[PDB]
Swiss-Prot record:
Associates with the mitochondrial membrane ATP synthase F(1)F(0) ATP synthase; the association is increased by inorganic phosphate (Pi) and decreased by cyclosporin A (CsA). Interacts with ATP5F1B; ATP5PD and ATP5PO. Interacts with SLC25A3; the interaction is impaired by CsA. Interacts with BCL2; the interaction is impaired by CsA. Interacts with TP53; the association implicates preferentially tetrameric TP53, is induced by oxidative stress and is impaired by CsA. Interacts with C1QBP. Interacts with MCUR1. It comes from Homo sapiens. Belongs to the cyclophilin-type PPIase family. The gene is PPIF. The keyword Methyltransferase does not apply. This is Peptidyl-prolyl cis-trans isomerase F, mitochondrial.
Length: 165
């Protein structure tokens, strides 16, 4: 009864792809959910609005969240530069899983990915913290702009984001 809903409105070269709505599993990972929630509202003075999907690999995942460097090197959490792996209770079960990117154990900041396949080799290494409620079609559009190196063929921008409930 207390899982937040947040949204990302996404454009590719200025054309609207639509809205991704995410349920954040605060019932399982409240600290990880709270970090992402506040980065969507921007209430700490920084967050995801105007950042990009900077690494998109077809048949794998769409990665975003580096709102400082727009390239995978940056981002930060609301708690500090990084925060621990809360738990690995939720698993990478299939497309639409929302999970934290990282740089090894206990290095969560703000970068995240949405899976487009079951990525079960990431279980126990990346903290799953939500899923797509609405807009998997938008995720599939983002995925279509990826490449095997992760370089996107269009500039994929989160033009708006926030908390719905
Ligand atoms: Cl990663
Ligand atoms: Cl590149
Ligand atoms: Na907003």
């Amino acid at each position: 009864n207390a899982n937040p809903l947040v949204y990302l409105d996404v454009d590719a070269n200025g054309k609207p792809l639509g809205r991704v709505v995410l349920e954040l599993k605060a019932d399982v990972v409240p600290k990880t959910a709270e970090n992402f929630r506040a980065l969507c509202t921007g209430e700490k003075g920084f967050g995801y609005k105007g950042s990009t999907f900077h690494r998109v690999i077809p048949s794998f995942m769409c990665q975003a969240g580096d709102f400082t460097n727009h390239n995978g090197t940056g981002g930060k959490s609301i708690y500090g530069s990084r925060f621990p792996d809360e738990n690995f209770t939720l698993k990478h079960v299939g497309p639409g899983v929302l999970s934290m990117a990282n740089a090894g154990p206990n290095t969560n900041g703000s970068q995240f990915f949405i899976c487009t396949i079951k990525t079960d080799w990431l279980d126990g290494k990346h903290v799953v913290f939500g899923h797509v409620i609405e807009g998997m079609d938008v995720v599939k559009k983002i995925e279509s702009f990826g490449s095997k190196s992760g370089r996107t063929s269009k500039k994929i921008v989160i033009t708006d984001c926030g908390q719905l409930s």
